[PDB]
Amino acid sequence: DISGLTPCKDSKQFAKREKQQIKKLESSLKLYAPESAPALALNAQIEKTKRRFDNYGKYGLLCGSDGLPHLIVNGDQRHWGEFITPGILFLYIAGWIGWVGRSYLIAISGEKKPAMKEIIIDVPLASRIIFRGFIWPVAAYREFLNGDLIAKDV
Amino acid sequence: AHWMPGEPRPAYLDGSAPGDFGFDPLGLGEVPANLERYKESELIHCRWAMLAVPGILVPEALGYGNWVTLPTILAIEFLAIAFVEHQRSMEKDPEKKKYPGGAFDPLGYSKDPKKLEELKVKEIKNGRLALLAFVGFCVQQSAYPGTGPLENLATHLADPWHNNIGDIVIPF
Amino acid sequence: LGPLFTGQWNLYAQNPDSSSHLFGTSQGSGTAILTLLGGFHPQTQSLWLTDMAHHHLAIAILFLIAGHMYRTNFGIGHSIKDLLEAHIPPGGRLGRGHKGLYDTINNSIHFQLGLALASLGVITSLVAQHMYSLPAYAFIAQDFTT
Amino acid sequence: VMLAFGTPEKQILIEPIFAQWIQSAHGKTSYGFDVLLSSTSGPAFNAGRSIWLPGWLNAINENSNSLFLTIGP
Amino acid sequence: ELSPSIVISLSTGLSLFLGRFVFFNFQRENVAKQGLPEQNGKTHFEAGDDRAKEYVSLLKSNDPIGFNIVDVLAWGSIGHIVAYYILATSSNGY
Amino acid sequence: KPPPIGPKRGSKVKILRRESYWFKNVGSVVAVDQDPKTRYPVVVRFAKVNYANISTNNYALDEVEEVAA
Amino acid sequence: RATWLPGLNPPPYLDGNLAGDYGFDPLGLGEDPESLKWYVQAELVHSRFAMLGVAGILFTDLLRTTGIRNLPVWYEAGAVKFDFASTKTLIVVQFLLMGFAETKRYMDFVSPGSQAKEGSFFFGLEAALEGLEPGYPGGPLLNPLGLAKDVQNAHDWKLKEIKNGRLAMMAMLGFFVQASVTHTGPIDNLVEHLSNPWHKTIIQTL
Amino acid sequence: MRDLKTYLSVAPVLSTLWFGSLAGLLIEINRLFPDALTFPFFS
Amino acid sequence: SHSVKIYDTCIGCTQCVRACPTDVLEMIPWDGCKAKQIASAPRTEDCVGCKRCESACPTDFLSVRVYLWHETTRSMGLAY
Amino acid sequence: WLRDFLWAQASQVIQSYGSSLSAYGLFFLGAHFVWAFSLMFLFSGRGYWQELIESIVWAHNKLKVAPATQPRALSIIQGRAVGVTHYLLGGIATTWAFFLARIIAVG
Ligand code: CLA
Ligand SMILES: CC(/C=C/C=C(C)/C=C/[C@@]12O[C@]1(C)C[C@@H](O)CC2(C)C)=C\C=C\C=C(C)\C=C\C=C(C)\C=C\[C@@]12O[C@]1(C)C[C@@H](O)CC2(C)C
Ligand SMILES: CC1=C(/C=C/C(C)=C/C=C/C(C)=C\C=C\C=C(C)\C=C\C=C(C)\C=C\C2=C(C)CCCC2(C)C)C(C)(C)CCC1
Ligand SMILES: CC1=C(C/C=C(\C)CCC[C@H](C)CCC[C@H](C)CCCC(C)C)C(=O)c2ccccc2C1=O
């Protein structure tokens, strides 16, 4: 109920959005037979919409006066599924990408012509490294403590 | 002679200073001039807090004032204290800025240097303890608005395993 | 000026145009000249002229006090050169601090111009952000193109 | 896209909680944070309780004027 | 009423006492340490500006510490300031 | 002197020249002109080219500094 | 030796002289040596805490399921309100005491001679904290029995320790996930598996 | 062939392989787990 | 017109002047390099500023260096 | 042309949000974008981007992520090529979306 936003499980305009989209998809449904592929696909999209709205209701999303879910990023424990848990889920993958790429560039750095390994990606080397970014939040922390994360100028 | 035995003591404080335990993890006292100013200010903060804490618990044990008009008492305070503080600022010898002696040292406690060093250690230890005690007073008055320090000690001694800091430090 | 010299400044905030004032006529007006009642005039949806008067007065006190800061021909005041050579942090984080900066600004007209345009642009955006929200002119909030 | 797919309920709408907090920190009761000026018990509200805050509150809460607009995603 | 003629003279005499007796040595120390407002390593008067010429005539006081008229203006500007601050903050019942 | 004056052929060297592309970057000395009249004898060979697609440049003795490795 | 999967040589930065090595470091975490030392102490402490955990869960659930004592489920065990003390006090007391323990362990790890030399007063006991080893402190306080008085030539004992502890950690992860998707105790899940093993497993949870 | 695999490991071929695999992953996730705005597990 | 300058980092490879389409440059003897020659710029009045000279100087940054300056009819390359 | 052709006949590509013609309005805005993005290339020059690239290459070399294939700003002729192709693609896809939605809607 924060920021003047009513939850979507007890919002009027949210249910109105639901009803309006369902009537829109049903207006496009009285043009085909109820057993053919178009009508079946339209009914599947209808159930998709209804479950979508009900899932946004049951997660405790906050729907404003416009009747759309307004995500809360401030750090409220009820709304960590909005930003903070998927934010950690992001940063874990993003640091995976960065860490496997960095360890790859460091792996090829001791090559005769390293640039050809950035064009012709050494798939065995990367694949042996591709899972080494699973542990990036600890390996990077140690490389920061040991001094191996940041390079020295010389 | 170390705040956490095992941590490497920095190079700039090693035990020689009166109250040296090697607690400079942020590296504030790196340069010597700031270090000297810091120990001066430390002694002054210490002496003010040690003047304060017996001016808190003694009114609370008997008076129960809870340690809680302007344009005259404020003026007399500023006049009486700015004079002393600037006259203190006008000294340039640092060991005499921390420990003037002379007209400030009657009773001859500063007559023997070894006992002078031991008493400087005593001053700084009791003073750090009193600074902690005053910060405790302030935060215990912030958390509990309308209670006294000795009142809080009675609250602890009543049921210590149920009335402690934990009630404020975690939400539960 | 009895209230001003006698210190009884509160006598200048006695009848602060008590909410029925028509801008340009004595109906619902008052006698105050300097107020801090804040908010907007109800007719104009603008700031009170007494608030602007007290405002410019207060910042006049501040600027007239601040303009007696820097050293001049009368023996007192600050030298900005030593203010800058004194603001060098021990620790070497900033390094040599603001040393030699008075000479590289005062000789450099482009540095003066850059700092001036910095401040001017920020306060111009401030003029915009505060004239749209806190209009200080009568009947400018209700007209919408200006 | 979510509008182009007729699904405006799927949009990324982040309510500006921090600017709304500053607004409620100045007397705007349109969010219900009740902090430092919308809370009557706040000492900041108690200090200027008799100086400017009546006019400033009936100004900032009045949704016709243009200071501290009701902001959204 | 705080007797607006008594508080103001009181605060002015207070500022002058705090100036001459309590800290003039600190103020004159900081004046001599900050020094003149030099440009390119020299005073403005030493750089060709005929109009600076720090007025030693106005500074030549025979008060035995050196409390010149400018320091009298300084301590007394602060005095009247604190006086009217007290008077105004005491006028309204806030 | 007729013996070498500069770094050894192969000594990885750092560049102190502020206007070069490889400033504060290591190199690899491939030659040192032993003529005691040229101004920039130290022929270095770096690993990554400059903007002109060149990996080598002459440097002076004072515009160069060998690393501890 | 036998290093955790045949057909792969162990990494050259760890081999032989370490508590239950077996050469499993495919993700290059013990590549740096001081990192490996820190991780060894981490592993030992983790495994010992996990062993105490598995004992304190299996024993309590043997008492619970059979019905010797009415102890709560491991899942719903933290919210037990004790009469003499409160959890709000217990967290703070744990913080204090385990801080005095773990910071001492740390300052020994970074400086082995510490906690026993000078001004390290713990009720006059500045001798039981000699350490003798990283991760294996010894002394009358920590090993009163002293089964392994020596510790370098105690590879059997340390190997038993680390193997039982790796297994206890894996069993603790079992307790974490097995009782978050089934919402019962470990012994309940076991006797559910030992009635119809081919019909009650992880994937028989629909 | 060694050179055919050398070409398959080239940056564009491997990029389109990687992004086709990735795109199939995200696509099948947004079909099996469509219309997702909030992470409800341990919410 | 333009101010062409040759600095002492020149190796005497004769590309600056073999690239220069307006005869601005010329190689002269010198004792600062293994080739014993350095470029000079006498005919800067004929310098258009095309910087083909310094697009062919193989040094750390440059040895030849063209400074754009007072543009006349011949530095602007006008047939009218 | 601005009123009766552009403004008016672009009332079926922008109002086509939630319709079957919604990819047309999507590419209307997108081709607008790609055209404008092209203006970053046609207007700018290589030297600024090489200096910026060398700054962020310092930021990479600080973390041992210096790529051997040296990051170079686009060649000048390449900046012009990228500009003209994004400009043409954007203007042309704008027009394509506008025409197709306009003429499919009122048909
Ligand atoms: C950067 C801005 C931005 C953001 C934040 C989003 C965000 C989102 N968009 Mg939008 N979108 C954008 C730009 C953006 N989009 C643009 C530019 C376009 C035009 C191309 C679109 C077009 C678009 C469409 C058409 C749709 C979305 C949808 C979505 C949602 C995707 C949820 C989903 O399926 O993920 C679920 C998660 C994954 C796919 C990732 C899985 C990762 C794997 C499994 C690895 C993780 C596991 C790993 C092993 C670690 C586990 C832990 C342990 C092992 C350590 C989400 C709200 C969809 C939706 O539902 O809208 C609400 C949708 O229908 N977007
Ligand atoms: C500490 C621990 C558990 C401790 C549990 C305790 C105290 C439980 C206490 C309680 O229950 C009781 C007793 C009583 C209850 O009433 C109350 C509570 C309080 C609830 C588990 C650790 C559990 C730790 C686990 C599961 C760690 C697993 C690590 C793995 C698998 C690592 C793998 C790798 O790192 C390597 C080895 C090498 C790399 O190269 C490759 C990869 C693959 C990355
Ligand atoms: C909580 C939150 C928030 C906020 C937050 C913040 C404010 C933060 C900050 C933060 C910060 C302030 C940070 C900083 C940082 C810095 C640095 C300096 C870093 C560095 C790093 C590195 C260097 C890394 C690297 C890597 C990795 C690890 C990954 C990949 C690879 C690489 C190599 C890249 C909010 C409310 C909004 C929302 C919710 C959430
Ligand atoms: C932006 C810009 C640049 C810089 C443009 C850069 C170099 C393009 C940005 C890098 C591209 C996108 C390559 C990076 C993607 C690689 C294929 C690496 C893959 C990494 C993942 C995405 C897979 C110029 O060089 C330029 C030159 C002349 C006039 C105008 C301009 C101009 O406007």
List the helices and strands and how they pair.
This is part of a larger assembly, with 10 protein chains of 9 kinds.
Chain E: H1 6-22, H2 25-34, H3 56-59, H4 69-91
Chain G: H1 33-66, H2 87-110, H3 155-178, H4 186-193
Chain H: H1 2-8, H2 11-32
The ligand CC(/C=C/C=C(C)/C=C/[C@@]12O[C@]1(C)C[C@@H](O)CC2(C)C)=C\C=C\C=C(C)\C=C\C=C(C)\C=C\[C@@]12O[C@]1(C)C[C@@H](O)CC2(C)C is lined by residues 24-27, 29, 46, 49-50, 53, 56-57, 74, 77, 169-170, 172-173 of chain G.
Please, could you describe this protein's structure?
Chain B: Chlorophyll b 1 binds at residue 3. Chain B: Chlorophyll b 2 binds at residue 47. Chain B: The light-harvesting complex (LHC) functions as a light receptor, it captures and delivers excitation energy to photosystems with which it is closely associated. Chain B: GO terms for molecular function: chlorophyll binding; metal ion binding; mRNA binding; protein domain specific binding. Chain B: Chlorophyll a 2 binds at residue 45. Chain G: This is Photosystem I chlorophyll a/b-binding protein 5, chloroplastic. This is part of a larger assembly, with ten protein chains of nine kinds. Chain A has 154 residues and is mainly alpha-helical. Chain A is 57% helix and 5% strand. In chain A, helix 1 (12-27) packs antiparallel against helix 2 (37-58) and helix 3 (84-109) runs antiparallel to helix 5. Chain A is elongated. With 69 residues, chain F is mostly beta strands. Chain F contains no helices and five strands. In chain F, the strands form two sheets. In chain F, strands 2-3-4 form a three-stranded antiparallel sheet, with no helix packed on it. The radius of gyration of chain F is 11 Å and the shape is globular. The radius of gyration of chain I is 12 Å and the shape is elongated. Chain I is built from one helix and four strands; from the N terminus they run E-H-E-E-E. With 80 residues, chain I is mainly beta. In chain I, a hairpin with a 7-residue loop joins strand 2 (26-29) and strand 3. Helix content of chain I is 5%, strand content 20%. Chain J is mainly α and 107 residues long. Chain J has helices at 2-9, 22-43, 46-61, 76-105. Chains D and J meet through loops of D and helix 2 of J. Strand 3 of chain A pairs parallel with strand 1 of chain D. Bound molecules: chlorophyll A (CLA), the ligand CC(/C=C/C=C(C)/C=C/[C@@]12O[C@]1(C)C[C@@H](O)CC2(C)C)=C\C=C\C=C(C)\C=C\C=C(C)\C=C\[C@@]12O[C@]1(C)C[C@@H](O)CC2(C)C, beta-carotene and phylloquinone. Beta-carotene binds at residues 73-75, 83-84, 95, 98-99, 102, 136, 140, 149 of chain A. Chlorophyll A sits between chains H (26, 29-30, 34-37) and D (1, 10, 12).
Outline the biggest β-sheet of chain G.
none
- Oligomer classification: part of a larger assembly
Number of helices of chain C: 5
What's the total number of strands of chain G?
0
How far apart, in Å, are the first and last alpha carbons of chain G? 42 Å
Tell me, briefly, the overall form of chain G: globular
- How many helices of chain G? 4
Largest interface: C-E, 26 and 34 residues
What ligands can be seen in this structure?
A: chlorophyll A, the ligand CC(/C=C/C=C(C)/C=C/[C@@]12O[C@]1(C)C[C@@H](O)CC2(C)C)=C\C=C\C=C(C)\C=C\C=C(C)\C=C\[C@@]12O[C@]1(C)C[C@@H](O)CC2(C)C, beta-carotene, phylloquinone
Q: Given the C-alpha coordinates, what overall shape of chain C results? A: elongated
* Helix-strand makeup class of chain C: mainly alpha
Q: How helix-rich are the residues of chain C, as a percent range?
A: 25-40%
